[PDB]
Symmetry: C2
Subunit: 97 residues, 2 copies
């Protein structure tokens, strides 16, 4: 809780699954998940653990509100958001110090 900011677009990561169905589904459908994440702006209480934790949590919540679907899409959304939040951390911390 504390104010989040919507980050700039980034290229969507390719997420890999051991199941052939899901692996292909992601390749074909990745263009439909967001390519931006909401995050808590970096300050003295921030570290990589809580930055990504907070980012994944709020981004997933906001996407539910914004979308006003399937089990498969939920699973994949969460994985792409985590990878994007890690990128966002690298962006915000290589700009903080």
């Amino acid at each position: 809780l504390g104010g989040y900011v919507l980050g700039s677009a980034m290229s969507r990561p390719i997420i890999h699954f051991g199941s052939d169905y899901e692996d292909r589904y992601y390749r074909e459908n990745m263009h439909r998940y967001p390519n931006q994440v909401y995050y808590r702006p970096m300050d003295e209480y921030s570290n990589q653990n809580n930055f990504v934790h907070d980012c994944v949590n709020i981004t997933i919540k906001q996407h539910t509100v914004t979308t006003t679907s399937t089990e498969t899409d939920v699973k994949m959304m969460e994985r792409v958001v985590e990878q994007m939040c890690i990128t966002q951390y690298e962006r915000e911390s290589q700009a903080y110090y």
Copy 2:
């Protein structure tokens, strides 16, 4: 085949959107494997096909060798280890 087994590595930190899953991993991460199988780096490798192959072969090896929760967790762990292995291998390969 043409795969190798990697050295054991620190288990990855992974965050989940569900509070339950997020805590389950925290508490049960030590019971997923801490090494992956992968296609060793050569002039055809890049991050995408390396991770693709490593996830495919490692998951297949552990299927041959679960709750829905553990299967999800396992895949996330393997993918992060595969990404870390790529970083290690490509750094060495370009020397």
